[PDB]
Structure 1
Amino acid sequence: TARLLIIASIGQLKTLNKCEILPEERRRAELDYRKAFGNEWKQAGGHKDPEKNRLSEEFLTAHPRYQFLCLKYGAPEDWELKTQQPLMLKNQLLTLKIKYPHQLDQKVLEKQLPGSMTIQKVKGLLSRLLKVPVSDLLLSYESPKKPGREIELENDLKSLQFYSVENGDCLLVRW
C-alpha cells in the first residue's frame, strides 16, 4: 500500500527497489493514489468545475502530484468517495403491508421483515398469527411500481430479495 504511493510521488521513477516498473504498475499505483486521496481533495476545496477549483496550500504541499492526476484520469466522482461504512440489521428490514382479499373489513397490518427471510418463515408466521395451516396459505405480492400485476410465491426455499421485493411492497394472503 505504501509502494504504490512512492511511485505516485515521483513521475520518472522507472525502477524501485531493483524492480522494473510497467505501464500496468504505473496505472495501478496512480488509481490507488486518487482512490485514497479523493476524499481529502473534496474537503480541501476541490470541485470538478475547471473554474471553481480552489484548493488550500497544505493539501498541495502534501499532494503536489494530485493535480496532474486530476487531468490524467479526470477528477473523482461523488459515488467514488463513499466506501467507509458497514451495514446494520436496521438497513436489511423491509416494511410491507398485510392484506386479505377475502376479508376486506380487517385493518391494514404492517410488519418489518429481513431481506434474506425465506418464504417458509413468513408462511409460518402467518400460520401462527391467523391460525391457518401452512399448506393452506398461498402467498403473492404487489409493488407501487407494478400495479394490478400479481406474482406468485410458489417456491418456499427462496428469499424475498430473490423475488425482487423492495420497501413499500404489499403482501396478499389467501386461504
Structure 2
Amino acid sequence: QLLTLKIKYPHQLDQKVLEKQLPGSMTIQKVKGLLSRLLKVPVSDLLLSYESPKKPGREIELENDLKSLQFYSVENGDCLLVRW
C-alpha cells in the first residue's frame, strides 16, 4: 500500500534524483500537486509515466489524473519519470 518510488527527470539527468514514499491510493493529480510544489512548475504542465525494473526502458503512461497509482499497477520500487 505504501509505495517507495524513485524519481527521475529524464530531460535533466539519467540518474534517479530522489526517493519518495507515496500511498498506493494516491491519485496522479495529487502526485502532480506534490511535485509541483517541489519543482515550482504547474500541475497542468507535468507529464508522468513510470518504469518497472522487470521491463527496463519501457515507459507506462499515467494520463488520467483522477486515477490512483495502484490502479495503474505502480509497485514498490518502481521509477517515476517526471517531465515538464
Question: Relative contact order, CA 8 A, sep 6+: which one is greater?
Answer: 2
Aligned residues: 84
> Structure 1 residues 106, 149: closer, same or farther in 2, change over 3 A?
closer
Give the SS at the match of 1:162: helix
Query: Structure 1 residues 115 and 107 mapped into 2: Cα distance closer, same or farther (>3 Å)?
Result: closer
Q: Which has the higher helix share?
A: 1
Q: CA deviation at 1:148?
A: 1.4
Query: Contact (CA 8 Å) 2:26, 2:68: kept in 1 or not?
Result: yes
Work out the CA distance in 1 between the residues paired with 2:59 and 2:14: 21
Per the TM alignment, residue 107 of structure 1 is displaced from its structure 2 partner at its CA by 6.0
Matched, 1:164 2:69: no
| Aligned counterparts of 1:107 and 1:161: Cα–Cα separation in 2 | 21
What is the RMSD computed on CA atoms of the aligned residues? 1.5
Q: Report the CA distance shift for 1:105/1:166 in structure 2 as closer, same or farther (over 3 A).
A: closer
Shift of 1:108: 2.3
Unpaired runs of 5+ in structure 2? none
2:6–2:16 CA contact under 8 A, matched in 1: no
Give the structure with higher Rg (CA).
Answer: 1
Describe the shift of the 1:104–1:119 C-alpha distance in structure 2 as closer, same or farther (beyond 3 A): same
Going by fraction, where is strand more abundant, 1 or 2?
2
Q: Is 2:5–2:78's contact at 8 Å kept on the other side of the alignment?
A: yes
Q: 1:164 to 1:107 in 2, by over 3 A?
A: closer
- Compared CA separation, residues 107 and 160, structure 1 to 2 (3 A): closer
Unaligned runs of at least 5 residues, structure 1: 1-91
**Runs of 4+, deviation exceeding 4 Å:** none
SS in 1 for 2:19: strand
